[PDB]
Amino acid sequence: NWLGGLSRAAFPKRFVFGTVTSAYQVEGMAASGGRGPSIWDAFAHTPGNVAGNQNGDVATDQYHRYKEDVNLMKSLNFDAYRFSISWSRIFPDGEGRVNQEGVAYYNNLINYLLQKGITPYVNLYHYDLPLALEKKYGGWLNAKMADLFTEYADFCFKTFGNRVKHWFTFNEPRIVALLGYDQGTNPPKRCTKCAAGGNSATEPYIVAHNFLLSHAAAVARYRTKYQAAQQGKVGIVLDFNWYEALSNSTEDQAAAQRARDFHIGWYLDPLINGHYPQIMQDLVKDRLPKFTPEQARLVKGSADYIGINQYTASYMKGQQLMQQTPTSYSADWQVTYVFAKNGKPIGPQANSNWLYIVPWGMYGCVNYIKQKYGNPTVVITGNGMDQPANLSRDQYLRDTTRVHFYRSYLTQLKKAIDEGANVAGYFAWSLLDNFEWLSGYTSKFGIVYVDFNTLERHPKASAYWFRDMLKH
Ligand SMILES: OC[C@H]1O[C@@H](O[C@H]2[C@H](O)[C@@H](O)[C@H](O[C@H]3[C@H](O)[C@@H](O)[C@H](O[C@H]4[C@H](O)[C@@H](O)[C@H](O)O[C@@H]4CO)O[C@@H]3CO)O[C@@H]2CO)[C@H](O)[C@@H](O)[C@@H]1O
Ligand SMILES: OC[C@H]1O[C@@H](O[C@H]2[C@H](O)[C@@H](O)[C@H](O[C@H]3[C@H](O)[C@@H](O)[C@H](O[C@H]4[C@H](O)[C@@H](O)[C@H](O)O[C@@H]4CO)O[C@@H]3CO)O[C@@H]2CO)[C@H](O)[C@@H](O)[C@@H]1O
Ligand SMILES: [Zn+2]
């Protein structure tokens, strides 16, 4: 059976199925409707930064077409929709004046979702820091971000929280730290060798610390001011790809564990246990900021659920841990990536070079969180794969590899849940082909095809797969 035995009956009662987008990747109207620029607007408008010098000015134009898109997700039998609010659409300068037209958009979207029986899961932040805050404060390098983000979050809670009961603060802070401050390939393009300045050995850690403190501050505000009346929940979205020891050697097993700790433990040990992973403390030393006892107590337990974006897996090979001059967050792990074992690749690649199709990584990640962190409530907040550029419409629609991807990965998730993992929901990245950051429109992650000339939507085979799988 093309469903491979999957259906709602194969998952827990009340298990939530949804699709996901982010504001800059789908909304369009980037410089309209009162929206102020984000760091991604400036970045994308700079020649050479994005494939084909493309940007999110129009994207999928969900801003105008959101009722079409909500109708479509309802027709595909989804229960929920994860989307983000653009900070600079609400506060064009990141602070101060409210853009009422932007508020009205999200009200209209939220209300239509609810009208159609689709639960809104709302991210406050998805890489799109208001440009004014980058320039004025230095963005996530500045501890003042906790105050600035908390005030923004407060507004969103007050304005939308009578209707929105499922929030996330951040999306993949590890990726902001890594690409924005270690490698310097994403905004603000900081790194040791970078024109904008930076230090790949220190700044990723400062940035991660400020994300954790800002998350904790925003949640403290929710709990003290809004929770009694609104009775919702606030979590965070973290990326986690699996690491598997290349062999059963002590060294390789240690390397895979170090990778897990530097990847997910960086955020989860603070959120669950109130401290950074021991290995990071041991290796990063004075470059890793230290939580005060008060801050640690604020961060610990501050996520009502853990959003995990899960895509892929890698083999890890070890080495003797050495004393080394610090160079970068990436180099701090002291591991070696390997994508074959016993002469066989870990899996075939999707369009994105980093995305190896490895369904057992889903089981790996979910089981690991279950066993290591006391089985916290987890929501899979993003999982999917991409097709390349330049295919015909019909080639996009016949997305047999993506159908296989979802069947296999969801089978592996089901395996983990059946073994007792506390997973509450699953969200497919993405509802729509969209603006895929540095790849621009050359990477197609949607279950729904978007023609970027006409903006027409066409469900792909994988959309119909979900429709069949999710029928009530
Ligand atoms: O319909 C609009 C649109 O759909 C697009 O997607 C198609 C797929 O291309 C097509 O393969 C798929 O066919 C499914 C069918 O819907 C299921 O009912 C059926 O499930 C069987 C299963 O195979 C058996 O083993 C099991 O025992 O019983 C069930 C149910 O009887 O499986 C087939 C695949 O083998 O349907 C999708 C949606 O219609 C098309 O590409 C496009 O042309 C259409 O315009
Ligand atoms: O992309 C689709 C969708 O998903 C969400 O975020 C994605 C990012 O878009 C993507 O850039 C990021 O890719 C990571 C990848 O996970 C790592 O496996 C890879 O690791 C590197 C390592 O950094 C190097 O030091 C080493 O030498 O090589 C390895 C293997 O290549 O690093 C890349 C960064 O380029 O993955 C995220 C999820 O995992 C977003 O939520 C959404 O907005 C995106 O559209
Ligand atoms: Zn339009």
Q: Pick from 415, 466, 324: which is nearest to 20 by CA?
A: 466
Phi and psi at residue 343, in whole multiples of 5°? Answer: 80, 0
Give me the residues near ligand 3 (ion), CB cutoff below 5 Å.
61, 64
Give the β-pairing of 344-345 and 340-341: antiparallel
Say what angle helices 100-115 and 62-75 make with each other, to 10 degrees. Answer: 10
Atom nearest to 467 CA in ligand 1: 38
- Phi first, then psi, for residue 284 (nearest 5°) are -85, -30
Contact assessment for residue 300 and residue 272, using Cβ atoms and an 8 Å cutoff:
yes
300 by Cβ neighbours in 10 Å (0-12 / 13-18 / 19+) ranks as middle
State the first-to-last Cα distance of the chain, in angstroms, to the nearest integer.
Answer: 18
In this structure, the residue with its CA closest to atom 27 of ligand 1 is 1
Q: Is the CB of 468 under 6 A from ligand 1?
A: yes
Q: Which amino acid is at 114?
A: L
Which residue has a Cα nearest atom 33 of ligand 2? Answer: 354
Q: How far apart are CA 368 and CA 240, in angstroms?
A: 11
CB 260 within 8 A of CB 310: no
CA of 386 to the centre of ligand 1 (A): 22
Please calculate the CA angle 166-216-27 and round it to the nearest 5 degrees. Answer: 45
Cα gap 429→413, rounded to integer Å: 15
Decide the pairing of beta strands 306-309 and 378-382: parallel
Whole-Å CA distances, 331 to 183, 238, 255, 284, 328: 11, 21, 13, 10, 5
Ligand 1 mutation target, pool 464, 468, 469, 471, most atoms within 8 A of CB: 464
Atom of ligand 1 nearest to the CA of 397: 41
* Cβ(410)–Cβ(416) below 8 Å: no
Q: In sequence order, which residues have a C-beta less than 8 Å from that of residue 344 and are 6 or more positions away?
A: none
**Which ranges of 20-80 would DSSP assign to H, the alpha helix?**
23-26, 39-44, 62-75
Centroid of ligand 2 to alpha carbon of 354 (angstroms): 6
Q: What is the atom index within ligand 1 of the atom nearest the CA of 398?
A: 41
Residue 330 is encoded by which pair of tokens?
A: 């990436």
- 177's enclosing H/E stretch is helix 173-177
With CA atoms as reference, report the closest residue to 179 among 202, 197, 204, 201.
204
**Phi, psi (deg, nearest 5) at residue 337:** -75, 140
List the resolution, Å. 1.6
Residue 329: count of CB within 10 angstroms of its CB: 26
Domains annotated on the chain, with CATH: 1-472 (3.20.20.80)
